[PDB]
């Protein structure tokens, strides 16, 4: 009734990245507690306004999870990321998208 859980943050594209081809960028935030959380998707460090997200849910161990997504067109140079703030974080945690 007391131990807080820091969010796990996973950033991935819906389809394999192809420069110039439209795609979708996903940020899955999970395993956190309590539920209050702030999530933004960034393009070259700037907040994307047209972002959608799921209604709050939680897993079997009661940890919350949320999916944030936006349409995006990857390029060779542009950088995308997911920026999260939670009570467990001193400052926002930024996880960059890695097509690998």
């Amino acid at each position: 009734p007391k131990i807080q859980r820091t969010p796990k943050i996973q950033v991935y594209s819906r389809h394999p990245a192809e420069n110039g081809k439209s795609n979708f960028l996903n940020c899955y935030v999970s395993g956190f507690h309590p539920s209050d959380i702030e999530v933004d998707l960034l393009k070259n460090g700037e907040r994307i306004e047209k972002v959608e997200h799921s209604d709050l849910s939680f897993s079997k161990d009661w940890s919350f999870y949320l999916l944030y997504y936006t349409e995006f067109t990857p390029t060779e140079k542009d950088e995308y990321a997911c920026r999260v703030n939670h009570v467990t974080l001193s400052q926002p945690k930024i996880v960059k998208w890695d097509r690998d």
């Binding site: 996973q10 959608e52 009661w62």
Partner: protein
């Protein structure tokens, strides 16, 4: 039949202080959301045209009223009792209740509750059962709740009588979406791994529905036991993404392939072949 086999509603009630609490709620078929709860109106949002299952509008409205009254009363009662229960603010309560269809046809119902992210209580054969993690606090709660006229009877009816017929009606009403088959796409990538002359190969599988999937790194007909599965991650619009990785010596990556089996493929497995020296 394929697709989800369970319906459940969830509750998250966040108590900021003695005078401020807010509740979020929703309805689900396994991990697929089918209902939202609109706190602006105190009513449900039906996310699919078939989300009411076989229920009449009157019964749906009666259930929304039950939930509205419950959400309001719950916050109020917990604020009144918070002192009696040695409760420090802020705190969060979670609940989940529903039913699931098993092989052989039995439908089993459940209700669980949490405090501070830990199990607190459950409902076992129409009775409030305190969880050990809830300690004496959960014991006091179980003794308190049963004193409230009608509450346990309404829970009993909803869990063991209303939920099973709802579940069956909605699994039938939603079958064209719930039992659709959506083919995955798959691709390979590679990356460095910590060991000397060690590489990590990645088989990506995305866009499949229903959720069950089989992905394996292979050498001809030999399944590579070293295959490591990632967590199944959601996409928007009811599909999933999964990565299967393999850690391999540099000179032994040649000959590897990734094999994907999914219900949608009609026995035509996807097979991707890893090729060396940067040839994709």
């Amino acid at each position: 039949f394929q697709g989800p086999t369970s319906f459940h509603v969830i509750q998250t009630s966040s108590f900021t202080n003695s005078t401020w609490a807010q509740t979020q709620g929703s309805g689900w078929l396994d991990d697929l959301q089918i209902h939202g709860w609109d706190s602006d109106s105190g009513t449900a949002i039906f996310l699919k045209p078939w989300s009411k299952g076989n229920f009449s509008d009157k019964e749906v409205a009666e259930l929304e009223e039950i939930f509205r009254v419950y959400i309001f009363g719950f916050a109020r009662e917990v604020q009144d009792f918070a002192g009696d229960f040695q409760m420090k603010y802020p705190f969060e309560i979670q609940g989940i209740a529903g039913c699931e269809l098993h092989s052989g046809g039995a439908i089993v119902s459940f209700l669980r509750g949490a405090l501070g992210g830990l199990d607190f209580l459950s409902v076992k054969n129409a009775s409030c059962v305190p969880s050990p993690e809830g300690g004496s606090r959960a014991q006091k709660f179980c003794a308190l709740i049963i004193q409230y006229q009608g509450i346990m009877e309404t829970v009993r009816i909803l869990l063991y009588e209303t939920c099973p017929r709802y579940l069956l009606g909605v699994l039938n009403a939603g079958k064209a979406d719930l039992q659709r088959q959506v083919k995955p796409e798959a691709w390979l990538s590679s990356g460095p791994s910590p060991g000397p002359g060690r590489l990590q190969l990645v088989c990506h599988v995305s866009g499949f529905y229903p959720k069950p999937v089989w992905v394996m790194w292979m050498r001809g007909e030999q399944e590579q036991q070293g295959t490591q599965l990632g967590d199944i991650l959601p996409n928007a619009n009811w599909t999933w993404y999964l990565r299967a990785t393999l850690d391999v010596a540099d000179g032994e990556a040649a000959g590897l392939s990734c094999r994907v089996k999914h219900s949608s493929l009609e026995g035509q497995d996807i097979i991707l072949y890893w090729r060396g020296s940067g040839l994709n």
